[model samples]
Target: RGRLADELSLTATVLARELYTVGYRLTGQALVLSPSSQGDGVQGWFLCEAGMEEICGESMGEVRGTGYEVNQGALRWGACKGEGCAPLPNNPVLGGDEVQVEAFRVAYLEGGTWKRQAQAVNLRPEGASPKVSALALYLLASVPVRGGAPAFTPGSTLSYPPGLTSSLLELPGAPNDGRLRAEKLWIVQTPNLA
Candidate 1:
């Protein structure tokens, strides 16, 4: 086949009423359970479009998401549940100096529309740089909030076999709809369940 094998497709775009959701997106391709830099690591797929963003002469690129009346080709990430699925890359959206960057776009819905965030984090694997990590793909089950968008709150279990690190720099956005743009997602890392 010409496309990637073992691809997982996920998206959650509805008004269920609450703040919870889930799905499949790519941080990279056919993701494997890449253990952390140390201790018990978390494991799963990055969940978004693999290699979908970053790589132009602009400050930030755009990867439009999927909604109720749109079908922009359900582009899923390459994932393999079993072992032997890894081989990841960093600097997801670094405009300069690609030193294994784990940068990503923290997307969320504001005024009933998707938005993006920015940061300058890097993947150190050792020194507390900025380790981006996540789990796999599935359904987007979320309840719309009282007045805001449905926060796709997944079970933030202590980091799995994936990379792990610090605390929340701050909270902004996540995959509220069915899909998060790989074009925008540039920083997602694993924190020893940080």
Candidate 2:
């Protein structure tokens, strides 16, 4: 079997290699695609930064301090905390299809002008399957999870005490077990742009 790298867009592969160097892994089954920051409708990969101790499920937020996004040859940062930032340039689209992903042609900063290559790779994924682990389901079936709720809780909604919002005051009692976990498969990636 090959790595998710073989199927990633050129920009995604470049960013993935960068993360892999420091210590990031290809977990989960879903491969996310976001719109290009160039205002063009073209889409690219979206990877969440994570480490060995934190795979697809719980503890994701523990290491999710930074992330990388690439569309075409352009790169952007995702929801940066004190160290990271936000999503891609454009709003996310909900529907799409699995067309043959032509090879990635990345534009790098070589000396000055943005440089690109004429060649490309058809590294796209196969197709749709309810049992498939990745987000490709959304692309293939026109919905993220069909028939029923996803296998896992995915996430939750909670609020803090009114006065506790701005201050660093500790919670009066044992903090609600706010630990989050994903029962099903998921993936996370970390970027080391420094």
Candidate 3:
């Protein structure tokens, strides 16, 4: 989470590539998909993190526009207009307000083959904002090789009440040397799949 902008950019590139392969091209703008399914689909425009850069201009603050004319095709980005144009806040990595924050660090062992014990982290108090309604614990998995750091994939997540800091997660299967860290701790105020 050190460099959110760069990290998100890289992720966008990866997602764009994958989507292209599946015959889905990014419009470069937010596209709110509307279909009858799962009691879902909101009114907000959908765009990748890269689109956030384009819609918000050079500054990242004004990236929270709710509604504006978006192209149906090509998905080119658009600038925020009217009252909905506002800056996003409480973003830890992108330099914004600090909200309820939680941190965790874990270490595990991997052998050729072994029945490993369950791994967990203790989340007490870290002087983080108590406004946190939900927590996102990103698990970074890596195997030490040639001294290069590997990208951590999505391990697991927790919800409020049941999502105490002290939640346990299933360790990775297989045997390899790796270092573990709760790479990203996202503090959410609302319970939406945004």
Candidate 4:
């Protein structure tokens, strides 16, 4: 924790975060990675901005209220409808292990990143170790879930994979809900830059 800031300095260098294709690519609901003005098919975000003095992130105004921050930092996203995106608090608290995040680092601005509630106290990629969360493992991996994940269903009910505990707490509609179109859900992310 004392050196979290120092560790973050190597974020861009350690992971080569210079590409511009950090924007989300949606294909008939199937999302992938694309760049600015690449096509819609490969388009870009415009209007408004988010972030801090460190650096501002990209925004898609009036369009789903989606904003992304991929410049000079970690891969982050947000949905600030009325305003710009914001930075995530660098809690940087390693839950179980340290090796997973060792492979990569997250970049942060001041106030304009997305809220990733699925995240497990900021866990990295999960391996054989029972440290990181399944959602982290799934999001960090390039391979697709192939439609549905075993630990999850089409509804809102989610399994607190034994691997990760910070799964979630009951709220308005959590852990128990057959109303959501879980089956219609699709998982996608920025393509592997490697």
Tens-digit per-residue lDDT, 6-111, candidate 2: 2233334334443332212322222222223232121222234455333323545332322343344333444322212233444222111331221112222212
TM-scores, each model vs. reference? 0.19, 0.20, 0.23, 0.17
Query: What's the C-alpha lDDT at position 21 in model 2?
Result: 27
> Which 10 residues in a row give candidate 1 its minimum summed lDDT?
1-10
What lDDT, from 0 to 1, does candidate 2 have? 0.24
Q: Per-residue lDDT tens digits of candidate 4, residues 113-141?
A: 21223121111133111121111111111
What does the lDDT read for residue 16 in candidate 1?
14
Error of 1 at 179 (Å): 18
Clashing residue pairs for model 3:
27-74, 27-75, 29-75, 30-46
Error of 1 at 102 (Å): 25
**Candidates in descending TM-score order:** 3, 2, 1, 4
Which lDDT tens digits does candidate 1 get at residues 38-92? Answer: 1111123222333532221131222222111101222122212322233222212
Q: What lDDT is reached at residue 142 by model 2?
A: 10
TM-score of 2: 0.20
